[PDB]
Structure formats: C-alpha cells, structure tokens
C-alpha cells in the first residue's frame, strides 16, 4: 500500500531555518504521480498549500511564502524535503506531505496523505518528558501520566500494542509553566490479572526517549 510518513527535526529555533523530511513507500517518485507537495495545518484551522516539486526540477511555491520556502527532492532515495527560513512563532502548525495526480489531463486529485507532525518553533522552556504512574467489582481501571514535555508530537502505547482493548486517550493541554501534560487510561476486567500485564509505553519522537513502566 502507498504510505507516506513525515520526519525531521521536531524542535526549531525562532528566526532560523525549518527542515522536514517526507518518506515515500510503495511507489517511485519519477513515475507514480510526478509531483509531491507539502501542506501545513494550524491547530483548529484548515489546510494550507506550500509547494510541490517535480523530479526534473519544476517547482511551484506559495506566493505568500515564496521568499522563505525552499523545496528539494532526491531522485534516488524516493524522499523529498522542505526548508523554511526566517520562521515566526505563528508558523507552528501540523505539517503534512501529499502527492498530486498529474498523469491525467490537469493537476488535481490530492488522494494520499501522510500522518502529520506538529512542528514547534518555540525554544522557550525546552525540557524532556517525564512519566508517572496512576493508582488503579468485575472490572478495573488504571492509567499512566506524562508531563513536563514541551514537544507536542509524543506517542504512547499499552502492552507494546498487544491486546489494546479498552485503551482510551485524552487531549493534552499547555500549562502556565510552559509544559504539556498527557493522560491515558485503559479499562480491563478483574480476571485479567493472570496474563497480559498492564504495561504502558511512551516514546518521545523529537528526542528518542523511551520509558517503560507499570
């Protein structure tokens, strides 16, 4: 299946150059759609087209962001990157990379999209994530707490993805001190104490931090 995945630095400094990398799998850039674009989406807002690049060198950038957007492509690794110089605090948005169908009559059909990443360009209160367990009838409930993390794109899991029935997640919030908090719980029967222990897993993408705790 044709799948796309966003990657790159998740933490950018203000007034510096932003960098991202999109990974394409299941197709060749030079033949599949001949064009691959970037799209950003602010929190709670709509999509915003940035620009696409052709493997032969044809490029088209957004007029509102012409002087800052710089796009390059790799004709061998099947990957394309995006550069954004002179970033501002308002540029924090959930970036995406998608493909454009050009083999037809006209350019259209934004069919496939990536997973997205919330690139943060703020450098204040940069700290590492921390985890804390939560205290736990025919059914039982328990969860784990994650706080003190500034980078928003964090990932959580339970029992390494095995038997995730009853797992529920809640949205995050930015505290007044400048750190986010995340909470997730799971509902399990009381007779499930024999196997499939209640392990909660976390993974901090911008720093590769992985902590396992019960």
């Amino acid at each position: 299946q044709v799948q796309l995945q966003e990657s790159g630095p998740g933490l950018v400094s203000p007034s510096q150059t932003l960098s991202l990398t999109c990974t394409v799998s299941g197709g060749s850039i030079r033949n599949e759609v001949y064009y691959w674009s970037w799209i950003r989406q602010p929190p709670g807002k709509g999509l915003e087209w940035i620009g696409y690049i052709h493997y032969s060198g044809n490029t088209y950038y957004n007029p509102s962001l012409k002087s800052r957007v710089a796009i390059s492509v790799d004709t061998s690794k099947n990957q394309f990157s995006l550069k954004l110089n002179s970033v501002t605090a308002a540029d924090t948005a959930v970036y995406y990379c998608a493909r454009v169908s050009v083999g037809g009559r006209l350019v259209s059909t934004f069919d496939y999209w990536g997973q997205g990443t919330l690139v943060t360009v703020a450098s204040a209160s940069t700290k590492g994530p921390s985890v804390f367990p939560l205290a736990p009838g025919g059914t039982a409930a328990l969860g784990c707490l994650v706080k003190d993390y500034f980078p928003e794109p964090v990932t959580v899991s339970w029992n390494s993805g095995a038997l995730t029935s009853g797992v529920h997640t809640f949205p995050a919030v930015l505290q007044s001190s400048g750190l986010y908090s995340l909470s997730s719980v799971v509902t399990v029967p009381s007779s499930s104490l024999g196997t499939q222990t209640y392990i909660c897993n976390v993974n901090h993408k911008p720093s590769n931090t992985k902590v396992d705790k019960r």
């Binding site: 999509l47 087209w49 088209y60 007029p63 259209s108 367990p133 205290a135 707490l145 505290q175 908090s181």
Partner: protein
C-alpha cells in the same frame, strides 16, 4: 490569487439533505478542477470529489455536487445525513499560475444527536510521584455531547487555592467529546488536607468523586 471561502460551521438534522457552498473570492472557479476532501477528527484528509462531478471508490453515494462559474460557488449536497458524516470539509482548486489554494474549512455538526451525560473519573497521585516531592491529580471528563460543560475543584471545605489547568474539549472519532483537568500541589498539602474532589458541572446535573487520601 485564488482565495476560496467557506462557512466556518454548518448544522443539520440527520436523514435530511444538507446544502454546502464554497465560493471563490478571486478568479474563475471553473478554470481548474475543484476537489473536496473530508478530515474526520483525529485523522488524515480523504478525497471525496474530483473533476468536479466524479467521486472515487469507497466514498458513499451521499456526496455529490457541481461547479457554477457564473456564481463562482462550489455546490455540495449531502443527501441522507448521518452521524458518521460529522467531519470537516475543504474545497480546493488551482490558480492560473499553478498555485493550489485550499478552502477555509467547514465543520459539519450533526444537531439531531441525543443528549449525553458527562462521565467523571479521578485518580490520586501515586507514591512514585510523591517520592519526587510533587503531586498532581488527574481528572477525566468524556461522553458529553454539549460543550457547555465546565470544571470545578474543592478541598473538603472550599475550592483549592493551587493552580488548576483545564483541557480544551474536542470531538472524538465516535461523535463524542473529550476533556481532562489537572491540579498540581505539594505532597505536604496533599497530606495536610482531608479529601479532594473533582466537580463536573452539567446542565441540570453534577457528578463528583470525592477521593480521600487518608483512610
């Protein structure tokens, strides 16, 4: 430019026809192929309409529309609205200078959904956090349809003086909301009080937990 325009939100009862129109403030909308995309809460956008009259596979037949250059409006009709159709929609076209522009977005809200009572869940700080000379209470709110739900905290005689953070409610994938609350305090204050409670306020109802740290 090719700046499109969409209404911010639209509501309609299920089993009815919904009319959605996206207008192009600049340039003839019929000069290029106009597309429509759907983005459910917490998911990637999905193509709905292409070539202005065609629909790809997998999309139900409830999505159709047409383009009128004389009124520069992108017509879109939703026949037989249901709960699963509650998602965002974006009209997209292309400028004459090959500049792709996406619409401002439109939040389709299913108004005919029944009422729902908010669920309350509270967890006291564990010993692993108390050993770090800190404490934080985690309260959970969900299963509530109306957005007028607020939060409240008390400590056995009165509200808590410490700072309290409240999460912003958002739609889930199952047509429901999600929220949470946090309260940070010192372990000495957690031990020097009799009980703490997370109070959730709803229209004509309220539910609390009242977890006691001692005994």
């Amino acid at each position: 430019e090719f700046m499109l325009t969409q209404p911010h939100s639209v509501s309609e009862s299920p089993e009815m026809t919904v009319t959605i129109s996206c207008t192009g403030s600049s340039g003839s909308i019929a000069d290029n192929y106009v597309q429509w995309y759907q983005q459910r809460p917490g998911s990637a956008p999905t193509t709905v309409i292409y070539e202005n009259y065609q629909r790809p596979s997998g999309v139900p037949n409830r999505f159709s529309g047409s383009i009128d250059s004389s009124s520069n409006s992108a017509s879109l009709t939703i026949s037989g609205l249901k709960t699963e159709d509650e998602a965002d929609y974006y009209c997209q076209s292309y400028d004459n200078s090959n500049v792709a522009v996406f619409g401002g977005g439109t939040q389709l809200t299913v108004l005919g959904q029944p009422k729902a009572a908010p669920s309350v869940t509270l967890f006291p700080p564990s010993s692993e956090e108390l050993q770090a000379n800190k404490a934080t209470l985690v309260c959970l709110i969900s299963d509530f349809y109306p957005g007028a739900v607020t939060v409240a905290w008390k400590a056995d005689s009165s509200p808590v003086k410490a700072g309290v953070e409240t999460t912003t409610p958002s739609k889930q994938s199952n047509n429901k909301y999600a929220a949470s609350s946090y309260l940070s305090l010192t372990p000495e204050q957690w031990k020097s009080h009799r009980s703490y409670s997370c109070q959730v306020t709803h229209e004509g109802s309220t539910v609390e937990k009242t977890v006691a740290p001692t005994e």
